[PDB]
Enzyme design. Sequence first.
Site, PDB file in Angstrom:
ATOM      1  N   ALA A  83      10.971   1.141   1.373  1.00 32.89           N
ATOM      2  CA  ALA A  83      10.461   2.479   1.630  1.00 32.89           C
ATOM      3  C   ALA A  83       9.855   2.496   3.019  1.00 32.89           C
ATOM      4  CB  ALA A  83       9.403   2.849   0.612  1.00 32.89           C
ATOM      5  N   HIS A 503       1.339 -11.804  -3.397  1.00 31.45           N
ATOM      6  CA  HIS A 503       0.651 -12.037  -2.124  1.00 31.45           C
ATOM      7  C   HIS A 503       1.273 -13.191  -1.329  1.00 31.45           C
ATOM      8  CE1 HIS A 503      -3.598 -10.156  -3.041  1.00 31.45           C
ATOM      9  NE2 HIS A 503      -2.609  -9.354  -3.381  1.00 31.45           N
TER      10      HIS A 503
HETATM   11  C1  LIG Z   1       3.079  -4.714  -6.917  1.00 32.70           C
HETATM   12  C2  LIG Z   1       2.179  -5.171  -5.787  1.00 32.70           C
HETATM   13  C3  LIG Z   1       0.815  -4.928  -5.847  1.00 32.70           C
HETATM   14  C4  LIG Z   1      -0.009  -5.344  -4.787  1.00 32.70           C
HETATM   15  N1  LIG Z   1      -1.305  -5.088  -4.815  1.00 32.70           N
HETATM   16  C5  LIG Z   1      -2.000  -5.038  -3.652  1.00 32.70           C
HETATM   17  C6  LIG Z   1      -3.281  -4.330  -3.493  1.00 32.70           C
HETATM   18  O1  LIG Z   1      -3.800  -3.710  -4.451  1.00 32.70           O
HETATM   19  N2  LIG Z   1      -3.887  -4.344  -2.296  1.00 32.70           N
HETATM   20  C7  LIG Z   1      -3.365  -5.011  -1.252  1.00 32.70           C
HETATM   21  O2  LIG Z   1      -3.987  -4.997  -0.161  1.00 32.70           O
HETATM   22  N3  LIG Z   1      -2.206  -5.680  -1.327  1.00 32.70           N
HETATM   23  C8  LIG Z   1      -1.488  -5.732  -2.465  1.00 32.70           C
HETATM   24  N4  LIG Z   1      -0.270  -6.412  -2.547  1.00 32.70           N
HETATM   25  C9  LIG Z   1       0.244  -7.110  -1.368  1.00 32.70           C
HETATM   26  C10 LIG Z   1       0.466  -6.178  -0.178  1.00 32.70           C
HETATM   27  O3  LIG Z   1       0.844  -4.863  -0.596  1.00 32.70           O
HETATM   28  C11 LIG Z   1       1.503  -6.815   0.732  1.00 32.70           C
HETATM   29  O4  LIG Z   1       1.124  -8.170   1.038  1.00 32.70           O
HETATM   30  C12 LIG Z   1       1.699  -6.045   2.036  1.00 32.70           C
HETATM   31  O5  LIG Z   1       1.989  -4.658   1.791  1.00 32.70           O
HETATM   32  C13 LIG Z   1       2.854  -6.682   2.811  1.00 32.70           C
HETATM   33  O6  LIG Z   1       2.981  -6.059   4.092  1.00 32.70           O
HETATM   34  P1  LIG Z   1       4.065  -6.587   5.148  1.00 32.70           P
HETATM   35  O7  LIG Z   1       3.965  -5.776   6.415  1.00 32.70           O
HETATM   36  O8  LIG Z   1       4.063  -8.085   5.205  1.00 32.70           O
HETATM   37  O9  LIG Z   1       5.495  -6.249   4.454  1.00 32.70           O
HETATM   38  P2  LIG Z   1       6.038  -4.912   3.754  1.00 32.70           P
HETATM   39  O10 LIG Z   1       4.993  -3.852   3.585  1.00 32.70           O
HETATM   40  O11 LIG Z   1       6.736  -5.360   2.509  1.00 32.70           O
HETATM   41  O12 LIG Z   1       7.073  -4.287   4.827  1.00 32.70           O
HETATM   42  C14 LIG Z   1       8.360  -4.844   5.045  1.00 32.70           C
HETATM   43  C15 LIG Z   1       9.252  -3.658   5.378  1.00 32.70           C
HETATM   44  O13 LIG Z   1      10.489  -4.186   5.869  1.00 32.70           O
HETATM   45  C16 LIG Z   1      11.558  -3.453   5.219  1.00 32.70           C
HETATM   46  N5  LIG Z   1      12.717  -4.345   5.287  1.00 32.70           N
HETATM   47  C17 LIG Z   1      12.864  -5.529   4.651  1.00 32.70           C
HETATM   48  N6  LIG Z   1      14.034  -6.113   4.986  1.00 32.70           N
HETATM   49  C18 LIG Z   1      14.629  -5.292   5.896  1.00 32.70           C
HETATM   50  C19 LIG Z   1      15.871  -5.306   6.676  1.00 32.70           C
HETATM   51  N7  LIG Z   1      16.715  -6.345   6.549  1.00 32.70           N
HETATM   52  N8  LIG Z   1      16.096  -4.273   7.516  1.00 32.70           N
HETATM   53  C20 LIG Z   1      15.242  -3.243   7.657  1.00 32.70           C
HETATM   54  N9  LIG Z   1      14.086  -3.145   6.962  1.00 32.70           N
HETATM   55  C21 LIG Z   1      13.754  -4.143   6.101  1.00 32.70           C
HETATM   56  C22 LIG Z   1      11.012  -3.199   3.848  1.00 32.70           C
HETATM   57  O14 LIG Z   1      11.809  -2.249   3.156  1.00 32.70           O
HETATM   58  C23 LIG Z   1       9.562  -2.817   4.141  1.00 32.70           C
HETATM   59  O15 LIG Z   1       9.394  -1.418   4.432  1.00 32.70           O
HETATM   60  C24 LIG Z   1       0.600  -6.009  -3.597  1.00 32.70           C
HETATM   61  C25 LIG Z   1       1.959  -6.248  -3.548  1.00 32.70           C
HETATM   62  C26 LIG Z   1       2.775  -5.834  -4.600  1.00 32.70           C
HETATM   63  C27 LIG Z   1       4.249  -6.104  -4.502  1.00 32.70           C
HETATM   64  O1  LIG Z   2      -3.601  -7.128  -4.745  1.00 31.87           O
HETATM   65  C1  LIG Z   2      -3.310  -7.008  -5.927  1.00 31.87           C
HETATM   66  O2  LIG Z   2      -4.054  -6.080  -6.733  1.00 31.87           O
HETATM   67  C2  LIG Z   2      -3.382  -5.526  -7.868  1.00 31.87           C
HETATM   68  C3  LIG Z   2      -4.409  -4.835  -8.742  1.00 31.87           C
HETATM   69  O3  LIG Z   2      -4.844  -3.654  -8.065  1.00 31.87           O
HETATM   70  C4  LIG Z   2      -2.643  -6.600  -8.660  1.00 31.87           C
HETATM   71  O4  LIG Z   2      -2.046  -6.018  -9.839  1.00 31.87           O
HETATM   72  C5  LIG Z   2      -1.578  -7.200  -7.754  1.00 31.87           C
HETATM   73  O5  LIG Z   2      -0.860  -8.244  -8.422  1.00 31.87           O
HETATM   74  C6  LIG Z   2      -2.206  -7.841  -6.520  1.00 31.87           C
HETATM   75  O6  LIG Z   2      -1.200  -8.048  -5.534  1.00 31.87           O
END
Ligand SMILES: Cc1cc2nc3c(=O)[nH]c(=O)nc-3n(C[C@H](O)[C@H](O)[C@H](O)COP(=O)(O)OP(=O)(O)OC[C@H]3O[C@@H](n4cnc5c(N)ncnc54)[C@H](O)[C@@H]3O)c2cc1C
Ligand SMILES: O=C1O[C@H](CO)[C@@H](O)[C@H](O)[C@H]1O
Length: 569
Positions: A83, A503
């Site tokens: 997204a 994470h």
């Molecule tokens: C279900 C869940 C719950 C979480 N809970 C929390 C929380 O409550 N609070 C918190 O702080 N963190 C939370 N985390 C962790 C946190 O959201 C992530 O660590 C963080 O958003 C990662 O950011 P990033 O910039 O590394 O990557 P991302 O935000 O994943 O960005 C990567 C982007 O690259 C794009 N992409 C990938 N491959 C390609 C390609 N080949 N070409 C073009 N585009 C591409 C993707 O579609 C995406 O938009 C959670 C994660 C998940 C999955």
């Molecule tokens: O950061 C987080 O908070 C979430 C809870 O808000 C938890 O469910 C995820 O597994 C975690 O990545």
Amino acid sequence: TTTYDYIVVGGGTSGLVVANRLSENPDVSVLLLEAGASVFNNPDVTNANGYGLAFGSAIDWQYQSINQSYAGGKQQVLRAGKALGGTSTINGMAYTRAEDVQIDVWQKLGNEGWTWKDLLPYYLKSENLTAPTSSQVAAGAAYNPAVNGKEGPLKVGWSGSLASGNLSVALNRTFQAAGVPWVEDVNGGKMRGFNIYPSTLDVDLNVREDAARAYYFPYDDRKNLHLLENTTANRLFWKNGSAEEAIADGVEITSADGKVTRVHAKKEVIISAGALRSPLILELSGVGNPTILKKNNITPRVDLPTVGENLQDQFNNGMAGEGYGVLAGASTVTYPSISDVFGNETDSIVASLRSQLSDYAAATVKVSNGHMKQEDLERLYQLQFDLIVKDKVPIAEILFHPGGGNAVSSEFWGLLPFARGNIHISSNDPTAPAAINPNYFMFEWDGKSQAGIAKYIRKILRSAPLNKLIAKETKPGLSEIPATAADEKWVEWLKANYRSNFHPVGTAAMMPRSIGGVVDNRLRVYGTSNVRVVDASVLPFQVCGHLVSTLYAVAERASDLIKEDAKSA
Ligand SMILES: Cc1cc2nc3c(=O)[nH]c(=O)nc-3n(C[C@H](O)[C@H](O)[C@H](O)COP(=O)(O)OP(=O)(O)OC[C@H]3O[C@@H](n4cnc5c(N)ncnc54)[C@H](O)[C@@H]3O)c2cc1C
Ligand SMILES: O=C1O[C@H](CO)[C@@H](O)[C@H](O)[C@H]1O
Ligand SMILES: O=C1O[C@H](CO)[C@@H](O)[C@H](O)[C@H]1O
């Protein structure tokens, strides 16, 4: 017509910050590449209480691990946002940061410029916190004005539905009785305590504040900022010339219409595809372990064999109880230290862990097929040990919230397991699923600490004043794990029922090259003139809190470093 100053690969949490900041210079053209699309009007995303709704949908990459051989052989789904806004669109909403000393360790590692003092202004720069209402305050909501920004793109605040209730009052008192302080703000570098946490929430609209709503949409009028959605970056391609040091020419892309083409970067390519993709893009570009590249019919361009290595993730478990009556109140987070969790048993736990560090390091060598050295892993693990034991950084996050009706839910995770894994391409086809292996439960501490946290929550549910509200534990419950139960029954249950905590960090780690780092202290990929990684890949160790706050700050700082480097170059 296909040329821009910067290309940012991945319009996610981190990438959107970089694209925003670089495009502040109206003479600099920036191209964002994002495989997904806008989720501005996706209700699974906008819903302030919608966490979980998007799992399994078209905006969830649903990456898949290999069999986890230290946890019973079961494979785990590793979720991620597909997204505009990346994983910030499908994640939970808690806004918490990191312990000061654990950021300081980044500079101790040999990464100049990365300390809590240096990063704090960038946390502030990222943030616009909305003060709590009178009723939110009465429930416990607070902040330290000195450590919260009021001008930044990321709106932060407390849920419109936050109210005092029997549960949040009781949890405060019960955690205090266990010796864990109520703290007003976990985001000033000292995270230990019980807290009514703020969220990544636009309180004006009452919607999730994802990275696109923060850093993209209010700026999308900038004519020098360009977005290609529904566009997959396949690999970088390189300028040809006997500069041995590799210079990226641009990015190969596949559009939705199926056209496969190139875009060119005049200055730099910034890779922000997330910890589970950025290393794959590097490998597909010939940057990585030549053994793996050659196996997959890719010409090696930079011999950097720890690309995809040093993957570090946490694992998440849940417990629950049932009230005598309806349970209500603010959601809470608790960050206990090792001695908070283990009490009279702490000395024993520390002695055991101390005696195992060298063994953990020896055992980690094989994960990277020998490309990290035992002596260097031992020093890394000693840094982490000192954080846990000498600095007493939190070892757990424990969330509590009403679970509907008389239900109370807790989710929790050990913050600093020692297990390291890796991720690598399975072929040179960019669409092929990677081999992803976090090695959950690899080391004794990782499971023993999780069990200690679970036992701690069991005790909390049975402690005053909370025990006046809570009739019984329902998950696991006493039938499944009796009161007399040993550590090992808990570990077995936790292994059977865990998921990834989502994470992952470290797959393009910022460390000195000589201990297996992939990027330097300015996030430049070693052996390249003009490629950076800016996303969770670069964090060299796990942090205590919720990743987005720290990734925003890291990308804010990175953006300044990139600008500085353009001015002289
Ligand atoms: C279900 C869940 C719950 C979480 N809970 C929390 C929380 O409550 N609070 C918190 O702080 N963190 C939370 N985390 C962790 C946190 O959201 C992530 O660590 C963080 O958003 C990662 O950011 P990033 O910039 O590394 O990557 P991302 O935000 O994943 O960005 C990567 C982007 O690259 C794009 N992409 C990938 N491959 C390609 C390609 N080949 N070409 C073009 N585009 C591409 C993707 O579609 C995406 O938009 C959670 C994660 C998940 C999955
Ligand atoms: O950061 C987080 O908070 C979430 C809870 O808000 C938890 O469910 C995820 O597994 C975690 O990545
Ligand atoms: O992923 C999961 O699988 C577990 C069982 O394998 C289940 O109990 C948890 O609620 C769930 O998070």
